[PDB]
């Protein structure tokens, strides 16, 4: 019948980043991309040993991180800075016949068995649907762009209006063999009003960790 | 004396990217850069075996792709989205004495011998002209920027105004040795309204393929 | 006490890039990032031989380069294009206890022993001060950002308002081993009105050379 999404109102005055947030909202406002050559040698072997698809498995890791730190779940409600209780993955699906992509969001759960079941359900449903947003918008989401075409050494998302655009964006490239290691390009872009080099740094470090500890 | 340029009006209704174009024209408007580490080992060996300069031969390969796929030949005319019959390369020539660059375009031809003849004629002519555009602006053109200074793992063009800026931009790096292979960084900035990940993707793949053939 | 900042007003009429500047200020205005996988093998072994920290040593090399070429020392003063006689580094300091970063600046000197003494004086002073700009703003400065958390293959900075923003920005990453070499990710962003490919090009080529020599 109905569902409500939860948030937390943050008073800037009590926040240790009050002066930074005020600056990257006005004078110093900027977004930044960064690309890493992620090692997924262990993440590939374990995914392939199991009856699993790479894409939703990696999605889950990302969402897990995104639901681990409040600096990623920030948005502007009614002119007020808030933190979502949870943030759901918006991922891209490619339609081979028409050469277009579509974006659909799955509901997030910590449990991987549960998340894949919701994912498969959404992809078995809207997977062949030609609409740009088969399910539509949801206030509390982050984005994952699949780029299986290019093993990129760089990726930069360059938006025209970045005002209040706090939702982080992942782009993942074509993985490849290098020595005894299998690496996958990963790009992350964020707003500086909500994310410092440190915030994105520890997440990307934990991103390596999780890709070396099962699904 | 007089010539008229290619013009194909796209009616947005009959297009499979109707709402895609609509979104990236307003709400989600953005450009995106990707750098790749291009293999040119076979390309350099065949260019060096013949009497060709590296620069014009590569320009041709890019323009061969640019004129193979309509998504790269898109532009806004009189408030309408059109596709140019053909698009011509605009390259940068460096003036070492004054430490500045100029931009001049050459007329595209599918025959390489003929295009290099045009290129030779154009560079022999205006190569020492200190005007920013010694030949002027032209509607149907894409960009190539030379950067033999730096072997970059990243390059990002970052336009202040991206309204209707559908013309794609290449930047090529200082090539270098790595084992047996010769890598040259290449980077494309493209408007998202006209190009999706897939579009840039197949062209980079075809860019690789074409480099592994002859000139 | 009192201090007058030196500059030189550039008349555009005589300048060889008058056409480019006018273009990259209106119609084709853009900034551009680029990341280089820097070879610091010789630079590390030299800094580690002495009792110097890596950060100030590198800060100095970048500043020595900005203050070498006028195209990095450009800005809009009172609606006019001026070149500062010198440009100072604004570097970042991370506070671990509160997980926020500050930005201070040290008056640049061509002599490394001198500079470091001022840098030390500033960090020993405001290194534990939790204000965003513990020293404040300065007309003539370039930016250096430490990113020791990620060994990035690409860093890209996208500013909202690039109007007249000619001050160059550096982002330096987590250095790592690659065979015999020790390489370190480095990004620069510049306004195309003040910087062409060649300017960034030679500075990064010189940056490699200055790293293969001594600390200063
Ligand atoms: O447009 C999408 N993805 C593209 C794929 O190239 C890219 O990741 C992107 C994401 C967000 C965006 N935005 O918010 O303006 C623009 C492009 C969907 Cl995820 Cl909405
Ligand atoms: O501006 C030029 N070249 C620069 C050099 O790096 C770059 O390729 C570029 C191309 C197009 C552009 N634009 O139209 O906004 C801006 C920079 C000339 Cl090709 Cl016009
Ligand atoms: O905010 C700062 N640094 C960040 C660190 O992520 C970055 O170097 C940056 C530099 C300049 C800038 N600007 O003025 O637009 C914004 C961010 C200070 Cl150095 Cl001003």
Structure characterization notes:
Chain C: Its EC number is 2.3.1.28. Chain C: It is an enzyme of class 2 (transferase). Chain C: Homotrimer. Chain C: Belongs to the chloramphenicol acetyltransferase family. The structure is a homotrimer. Chain A has a single domain, classed as 2-Layer Sandwich (Chloramphenicol Acetyltransferase). With 215 residues, chain A is α+β, with helices and mostly antiparallel strands. In chain A, helix 3 packs across helix 5 (197-210). The first copy, chain A, is built from five helices and eleven strands; from the N terminus they run E-H-E-H-H-E-E-E-E-H-E-E-E-E-E-H. The relative contact order of chain A is 0.22. In chain A, strands 2, 5, 6, 7, 9, 10 and 11 form a seven-stranded mixed β-sheet that branches. Chains in contact: A-B, A-C, B-C. The A-B interface holds A 33, 35, 92, 94, 98-101, 130-132, 145-161 and B 16-17, 19-20, 23, 28-37, 153-156, 158-159, 162-163, 185, 187, 189, 196-198, 200-202, 204-205. Strand 8 of chain A pairs antiparallel with strand 2 of chain B, so a sheet runs across the interface. One chloramphenicol sits between chains A (90, 92, 103, 143, 145, 157, 159, 169, 171) and B (28, 30, 192, 197).
């Amino acid at each position: 019948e109905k569902k409500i999404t939860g948030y937390t109102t943050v008073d800037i005055s009590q926040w240790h980043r009050k002066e930074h947030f005020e600056a990257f909202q006005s004078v110093a406002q900027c977004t930044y991309n960064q690309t890493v050559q992620l090692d997924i040698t262990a993440f590939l072997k374990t995914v392939k040993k199991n009856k699993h698809k790479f894409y939703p498995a990696f999605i889950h890791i990302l969402a897990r991180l995104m639901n681990a730190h409040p600096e990623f779940r920030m948005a502007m409600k009614d002119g007020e800075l808030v933190i979502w209780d949870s943030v759901h993955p918006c991922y891209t699906v490619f339609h081979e016949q028409t050469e277009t992509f579509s974006s659909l969001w799955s509901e997030y759960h910590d449990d991987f068995r549960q998340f894949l079941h919701i994912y498969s359900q959404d992809v078995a449903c809207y997977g062949e649907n030609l609409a740009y947003f088969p399910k539509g918008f949801i206030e509390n989401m982050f984005f994952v762009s699949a780029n299986p075409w290019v093993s990129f050494t760089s990726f930069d998302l360059n938006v025209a209006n970045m005002d209040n655009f706090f939702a982080p964006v992942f782009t993942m490239g074509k993985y490849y063999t290098q020595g005894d290691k299998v690496l996958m390009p990963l790009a992350i872009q964020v707003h500086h009003a909500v994310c410092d080099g440190f915030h994105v740094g520890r997440m990307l470090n934990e991103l390596q960790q999780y890709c070396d500890e099962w699904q």
